[PDB]
């Protein structure tokens, strides 16, 4: 899979999972989230050559088209595949609010 | 939607559907497909600013992160949303083969 095991601690140009830890206050200026203070959002980035983790038939065809005609700028894109949720705690005055946000953390990537 | 109505015949920088007709033989060198001779594959391309057709919570958060820190190269990507199939006819010797390929044509885009 295009996951941490394959992707982290390898520097490759093709589509792969890239690590990214976001500190809510420091990076986004969100001072209102109480816990957690940050999380491993991660992201997907890299080239999508022919048949490299192709999502659909369209990704397969476009990955071949883009190899032949790169000027078209029609390459498939390296995007999230598997994601995980994140539970946050924030206050609303003194009313503690707990919310489970789905699809917050990316665990694997694909060429779509 | 980020579809033909909004996107074609407008030249915008943000994520949008882009037209692309592929001629099998001329563009891909696939001489073995009998009908159709080509089709409207189309593609998705363009910038993903904060909240522009955000797919998941991760796309929402990363679109804000990328606005503040563009060097990170962590932007969400403009990718297919709705797709359509395409039926092709090809021969295998003199055995006509008919296949319906799913997700061949892109009709709308999203920032994922």
UniProtKB/Swiss-Prot annotation, chains A, B:
Q: List the disulfide bonds.
A: 7-16, 15-78, 44-109, 48-111
Tell me the compartments it is located in. Answer: Secreted
Where are the annotated coiled coils located?
none
Q: Which domain of life is it from?
A: Eukaryota
- Sum up the protein's function in the record's words: Multifunctional protein that regulates various processes such as angiogenesis and heart development. Activation into mature form follows different steps: following cleavage of the proprotein in the Golgi apparatus, Latency-associated peptide (LAP) and Transforming growth factor beta-2 (TGF-beta-2) chains remain non-covalently linked rendering TGF-beta-2 inactive during storage in extracellular matrix.
Subunit description: Homodimer; disulfide-linked. Interacts with TGF-beta receptors (TGFBR1 and TGFBR2), leading to signal transduction.
| Protein name (Swiss-Prot/TrEMBL) | Transforming growth factor beta-2
Which part of the entire sequence is included in the shown chain? 303 to 414 of 414
